Design a protein around this ligand. Structure first.
Ligand code: MG
Ligand code: MG
Ligand code: MG
Ligand code: MG
Ligand code: MG
Ligand code: MG
Ligand code: MG
Ligand code: MG
Ligand code: MG
Ligand code: MG
Ligand code: MG
Ligand code: MG
Ligand code: MG
Ligand code: MG
Ligand code: MG
Ligand code: MG
Ligand code: MG
Ligand code: MG
Ligand code: MG
Ligand code: MG
Ligand code: MG
Ligand code: MG
Ligand code: MG
Ligand code: MG
Ligand code: MG
Ligand code: MG
Ligand code: MG
Ligand code: MG
Ligand code: MG
Ligand code: MG
Ligand code: MG
Ligand code: MG
Ligand code: MG
Ligand code: MG
Ligand code: MG
Ligand code: ZN
Lengths: 71, 50, 86, 52, 119, 100
RNA sequence: AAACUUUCAACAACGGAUCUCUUGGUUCUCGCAUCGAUGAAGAACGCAGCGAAAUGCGAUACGUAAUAUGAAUUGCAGAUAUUCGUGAAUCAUCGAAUCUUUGAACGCACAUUGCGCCCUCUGGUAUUCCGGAGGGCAUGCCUGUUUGAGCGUCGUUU
RNA sequence: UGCUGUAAAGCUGGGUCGAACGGCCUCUAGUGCAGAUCUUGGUGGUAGUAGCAAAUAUUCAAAUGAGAACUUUGAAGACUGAAGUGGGGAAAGGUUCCAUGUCAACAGCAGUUGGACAUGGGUUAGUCGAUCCUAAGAGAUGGGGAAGCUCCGUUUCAACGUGC
RNA sequence: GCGAGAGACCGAUAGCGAACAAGUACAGUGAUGGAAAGAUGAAAAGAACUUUGAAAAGAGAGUGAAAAAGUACGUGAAAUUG
RNA sequence: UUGGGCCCGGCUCUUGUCUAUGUUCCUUGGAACAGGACGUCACAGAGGGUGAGAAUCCCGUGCGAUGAGAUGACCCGGGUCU
């Protein structure tokens, strides 16, 4: 997941199983003040939903990850 | 198969999560009687029947 | 070839999971559960199968609401809140 | 004793010709109870002779 | 053990929602830190604080609806009494005590006497 | 099936009789609870007697003509003869029978 | 004569009898009357600082409130936790709540996490399109309200 | 270790053991086993025996390791021979996928290897499917049967638009 | 069903199928079928340490009233075996 | 001969609190809850726990006493207003 944060400007999140890509894009905008280029979602073998959120070029995903505090 | 329903994949997620060994700190509790997980399941041995 | 060779041709499920009882007794083509009788309004049950009634009856699940009817009855089905003692 | 003790089985005798005694036996498969004798006062898990 | 419910009951809707937001961002920060600790018991405290604030908000809005509907003929069914279905179908005291005028005249005319014997 | 010089019996046990066997284990318990009901009923209404006054009537049939026993209620003529209305009598511990 | 075979004893095995227990069962008696469209019984899926099950619970998720009580919990850890006190633990009590997806199961459908429509608010240059939040839309029957249909039919006018 | 009794059995010495138990007068019964192709559990002889022989086939060296016929690499010798022992999929399975560790059990020899065991990681769609259509068919509604569970019927003897 | 009190009842092959994570594991397409399985010790005091071994283990030691109680746990019969 | 409504009691149900007398001495034992001696209480010598058979160590048991909540047109006894 961190290779995507670095190479692809993509933040990888665990997301609620009931939420769609419109709600995920709004949620990341409201929580972290960042614009998503796209949201690719996925349901994992353990039953949880993972979102690959690519940010627009205006935002640096590594900076957002440090700001959240997991890198 | 690769083409599976959501209801099927949700049952397979729960079946994967129930197929774990006993956490070892549980054997140290007072009056503990569980020595191992007795409900293990191997894919080739016992089928889920889903 | 009615034994081992014919047993190799089993890849078409006659039953799938039932929505009411979750048992894999829902006949796909009949659209009926052989266990609970879904989608009939009543639950399938017979007096010639008392062990089957044992397997699925009150107390075999959570009783998330009948748990507390006895305790509410014993207090006369109280309305209000408890008063703090002086 | 309970009125149905030893009689909560659908056991049926195998008949003769299978080199075993003609006591009723549990059907089905997949458990070790399967094929075991039932209903007899001499059988483990059967009902007693002349239940009280 | 987190926030105190009696201090929460003295707060307005806006102050409670503000504290709920603060508690939810604190829980999110803790869930981020759980990636590295990984054992982090304070999560239990924040989760129960969120539960308390949500409970107090709901209760406060429910006495507001009870006060709005106090004395009205029709009130929401979740604000009505919740006994049993049969006890709700049962006759009220007034209906059970309804009586024909013939039966009231006979009840009044011939009450059960109080008496004794051997005198 | 029939043997020796014995009386011929009528033992009616060819149905599922064992499903309808009533054994009165609760004879003493019912006696005690019956006594408690009787005490509670008396103490509720004391000093009013628990029993209404019953008449005395001849027993029917040629076999029980001689005997006399407690009836069900005093006739309307009897209450008329003692100047009590049946509606009033039922409230002072006297039983009424419109049928006799 | 060894070896080998057989018998016996000792010790050691194999196995789990015997003995002794017992928060279980069974039977008898006594007392009581309380499920559900205000959504039951049941099902599925989840929830713990570290848990697979059982037990408990429902996104407020091994629980929230309240009352009582009064210093624990405990396998380990840890307080922005607590001790002459609005105070540890507690299905002790319980009267306030929360109560996912379902299920008689109710917008339609369901081998699908498929498809609508209505109202209010909100974001996107929008009464119409796209997104989000909340609240709604089942059937039979009863009383009433309103709007109607029928030369079924009454009165009046050409 | 012996004693008593014709006997069923009773008592006793030594060893082991660890929490209850007996004599006598009576009461009571789910009260005595060699058998029932008895029941359940356990254990033998057979017996280190039958066997582990289809699908051409392995060999040398090095590495690793306590340990190598079986693991890895190199060299060779072969085979499948494109209607494959190749490369994908549908049904079905459900994590077997990948990496790391690892050998108690399992892989009817072995094992350092494994689809085993343990710990983690992993499945990204406006364009590929589902989703939609109708097929044989299934089946509500209005009705009509049936004591009823329910049966018939699919626009049917219906005042049928949540119309545009 | 809810709450209680009992017994000339059974005592883990008995008593309910279930004294235990039992209507569980498991079987069957399905209706259904359906087990086995209690006991160290008062207290884990569940054997530190040394040594041989690749390891499992063994041998010393140690705890304990007892290790003729070591979780493959009270006693430990018979078949069968050294 | 006689209507209705409230307030406190009693009864009924549920629930809180409170209570007698050895842990004295010797011996065995890992442990005394065993044996022996001297006792104590008893309207309590039911039952359970505690390192072995414990009335007297602990919980309870027995005896009562005293609070809280409920409930009842269709139980009564008092008030009080119509
Ligand atoms: Mg996708
Ligand atoms: Mg297979
Ligand atoms: Mg078919
Ligand atoms: Mg039995
Ligand atoms: Mg025994
Ligand atoms: Mg009993
Ligand atoms: Mg479909
Ligand atoms: Mg002992
Ligand atoms: Mg005796
Ligand atoms: Mg017998
Ligand atoms: Mg024998
Ligand atoms: Mg014989
Ligand atoms: Mg035999
Ligand atoms: Mg056998
Ligand atoms: Mg050979
Ligand atoms: Mg061969
Ligand atoms: Mg060739
Ligand atoms: Mg060819
Ligand atoms: Mg292929
Ligand atoms: Mg692999
Ligand atoms: Mg092998
Ligand atoms: Mg090997
Ligand atoms: Mg595996
Ligand atoms: Mg396409
Ligand atoms: Mg057609
Ligand atoms: Mg039809
Ligand atoms: Mg119809
Ligand atoms: Mg049993
Ligand atoms: Mg059994
Ligand atoms: Mg044992
Ligand atoms: Mg010993
Ligand atoms: Mg021992
Ligand atoms: Mg032993
Ligand atoms: Mg022997
Ligand atoms: Mg004791
Ligand atoms: Zn079903």
């Amino acid at each position: 997941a961190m290779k995507k944060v670095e190479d692809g400007n993509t933040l990888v999140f665990q997301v609620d199983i009931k939420s769609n890509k419109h709600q995920i894009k709004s949620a990341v905008k409201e929580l972290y003040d960042v614009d998503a280029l796209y949201v690719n979602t996925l349901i994992r073998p353990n039953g949880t939903k993972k979102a690959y959120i690519r940010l627009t070029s205006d935002y640096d995903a590594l900076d957002i990850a440090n700001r959240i505090g997991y890198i | 198969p690769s083409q599976k329903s959501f209801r099927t994949k949700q049952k397979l997620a729960k079946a994967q999560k129930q197929n774990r060994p006993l956490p070892q700190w549980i054997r140290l509790r007072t009056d503990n009687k569980i020595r191992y997980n007795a409900k293990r399941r191997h894919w080739r041995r016992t089928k889920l029947g889903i | 070839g009615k034994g081992t060779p014919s047993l190799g041709k089993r890849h078409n499920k006659s039953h799938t999971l039932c929505n009411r009882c979750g048992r894999r007794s829902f006949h796909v083509q009949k659209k009926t559960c052989s266990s609970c009788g879904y989608p009939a309004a009543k639950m399938r049950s017979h007096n010639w199968a008392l062990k089957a009634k044992r397997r699925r009856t009150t107390g075999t699940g959570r009783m998330a609401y009948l748990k507390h009817v006895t305790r509410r009855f014993k207090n006369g089905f109280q309305t209000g809140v408890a008063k703090a003692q002086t | 004793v309970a009125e149905n003790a030893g009689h909560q089985t659908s056991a049926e005798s195998w008949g003769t010709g299978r080199a075993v005694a003609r006591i009723p036996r549990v059907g089905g498969g997949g458990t070790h109870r399967s094929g075991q004798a039932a209903f007899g006062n001499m059988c483990r898990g059967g009902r007693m002779f002349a239940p009280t | 053990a987190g926030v105190k419910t009696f201090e929460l009951r003295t707060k307005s809707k806006e102050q409670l929602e503000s504290q709920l937001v603060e508690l939810k961002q604190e829980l999110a920060t803790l869930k981020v830190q759980k990636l590295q600790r990984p054992s982090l018991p304070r999560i239990h405290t924040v989760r129960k604080n969120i539960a308390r604030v949500l409970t107090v908000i709901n209760l406060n809005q429910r006495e507001n609806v009870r006060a709005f509907y106090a004395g009205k003929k029709y009130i929401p069914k979740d604000l009505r009494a919740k006994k049993t279905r049969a006890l709700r179908r049962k006759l009220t005291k007034f209906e059970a005590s309804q009586e024909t005028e013939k039966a009231r005249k006979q009840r009044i005319a011939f009450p059960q006497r109080k008496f004794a014997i051997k005198a | 099936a029939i043997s020796k010089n014995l009386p011929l019996l009528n033992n009616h046990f060819r149905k599922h009789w064992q499903e309808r066997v009533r054994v009165h284990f609760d004879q003493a318990g019912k006696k005690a609870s019956r006594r408690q009901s009787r005490l509670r009923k008396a103490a509720k209404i004391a000093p009013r007697p628990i029993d209404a006054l019953r008449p005395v009537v001849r027993a029917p049939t040629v076999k029980y003509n001689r005997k006399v026993r407690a009836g069900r209620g005093f006739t309307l003529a009897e209450l008329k003869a003692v100047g009590i209305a049946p509606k009033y009598a039922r409230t002072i511990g006297i039983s009424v029978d419109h049928r006799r």
